[PDB]
Symmetry: C3
């Protein structure tokens, strides 16, 4: 169902738009499977620097909460969705290439947990955000409880989880979730401002840094420096360290 | 020396008030044990689905650093005033049911740590927070420093820990010290607007996230994915999933 | 190389100033060591209560990302270059009293890594933060990837590290990078004001709270809670509690 084009300065920006408008980008197993293949075949591709994560068309980014609901099973098979859900939520946040959740339209349900998987959660001002997983009696399982609370904090993380109501993109700008609130079709052009300003930088000083921030939150301050100095030492062994010193 | 009222749609939400009005609902030895006994020692019943908390009177919530000066004892007699409040701040936030903090005017000193021992803090335009215990030679109460830095952050906590600054309640929302801001007169009804919404959704949908949320705030992220999976699996073993 | 002054009420505030304004006060391997002895290697004298740090010139605090950089050989010495910052950032973070950063102008690169190590940051209206160290080719040196993940947030800290650019004080005010933003004409005077409220406070309460918080950010809430209680009864034998 996925789509992709590869074009930028020196050939390529990995535009990924989940294309299945009938169910409004609902996150099933297949829409969770092909993401791995399209993001792990992209793992060893040296011709793509920056990745933008957007939704197809003009309807929504992902609306799998109140649209995709077939979970009438025993609880044993629920873990298989939990294991598969965690196989997709973190594999986007662990791709070395900087990925941006270029959110447009509705981004609740799976998209509520998928949007928080990128680096900068820049979203369309049309985005109505929320986590309507609790309204059916089940807390989010793909990582919406232990990843959100480290982004906006804990004072506000309770409000959008305990309640289960939809909030706007402008309202989300006061909590630190969305790092920039900007229009949707400009977000197509305005992301390219930030999708090649990133590319205009080095090729190793960005992804190697991504190995330090994405793993320094799980360790204390002293151990956090323990990973950063080697990364400072590792990027110190690149031809890009001395090329741009002019 | 207190009171509690429980009623909601299907009789789910509760309301507890510190009904000691004479000294403005301060925190001391005799009241702290009441708060730990009233919430019933780490757990509550199934009939109650949410516990709203505020201060009776429409005046200050708690003047815990203005008239409470029972602190002339030996250094071996301070554990009972330090550990008990930690126990007081241990299971107010960790009870197996959501708690909403209807902040109500003053929260100076020990009263603030009780407020920080709550989930959601619906504020009002009359509050005057602050922890001016450092001005007397002692850190804030019963876990102010560690909790506050986890809510607001590492930058804006030192500015309140070191100073004991006054600050208003409109700029308290500027730092994330509270969650929602509404007029004081409508605060009682506005707090109900959230409680009935937290009551009408589900029970297992919150209690299996309340346990998950209140355990992963300290450890790593992969460990944070540990309890959630077992909690998520546990929440599919109830008919509420099919409802 | 350096110039420091000390004059206020209670005789406890220190105005540490970097005195290399000709070269835009950019950090290197010889001025960082000059700032190690200035704070006296994890401790200081008994004549201080507060600390103020700000580069001399009133034009740029410590801009040292694209104004001064010499390392283009001997990649093994990068740890030797990275260790110096860690020794210069662990000393300030641990130091007995809080350090007030009255940054006025540019603060990028290694200089950006200095204000964030301070307890409280107050910036002038024309503040230009953000590390362009990524444009050079290597990630930030003595933190950046670490010290910014507990101040502003995990999402709004990626933007500065990845892109690499300069923003204004009001944006840093909005994101929370610098707590309070004041006009350049009312910052150096105001830095001498926030400290003076501290300077009239308890001597043992401010020092203990800094120790209690700076080592409680690194563990669990339950297991970092011990830091406060241990320091809680450490100030119950000094006259500050009673007098």
């Amino acid at each position: 169902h996925m789509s992709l084009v590869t074009t930028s300065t020196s050939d390529g920006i990995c535009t990924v738009k989940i294309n299945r408008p009938d169910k409004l980008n609902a996150m099933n197993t297949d829409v969770a499977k092909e993401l791995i293949k399209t993001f792990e075949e992209l793992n060893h591709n040296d011709d793509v620097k920056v990745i933008i994560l957007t939704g197809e068309g003009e309807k929504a980014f992902s609306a799998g909460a109140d649209i995709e609901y077939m979970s009438k099973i025993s609880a044993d098979e629920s873990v298989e969705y939990a294991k598969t859900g965690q196989l997709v939520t973190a594999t986007v946040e662990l791709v070395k290439q900087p990925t941006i959740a270029a959110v447009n339209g509705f981004a609740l349900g799976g998209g509520c947990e998928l949007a928080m998987s990128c680096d900068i959660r820049i979203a369309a001002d049309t985005a109505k955000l929320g986590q309507p997983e609790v309204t059916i009696g089940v807390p989010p399982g793909w990582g919406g409880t232990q990843r959100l609370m480290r982004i906006v904090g804990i004072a506000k993380a309770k409000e959008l989880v305990y309640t289960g109501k939809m909030i706007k993109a402008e309202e989300a700008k006061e909590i630190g979730l969305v790092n920039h609130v900007v229009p949707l079709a400009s977000l197509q052009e305005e992301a390219l401002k930030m999708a090649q300003q990133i590319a205009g930088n080095s090729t190793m000083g960005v992804q190697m840094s991504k190995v330090a921030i994405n793993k320094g939150r799980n360790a204390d301050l002293d151990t956090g420096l323990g990973l950063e100095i080697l990364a400072w030492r590792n990027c110190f062994t690149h031809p890009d360290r001395q090329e741009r010193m002019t």
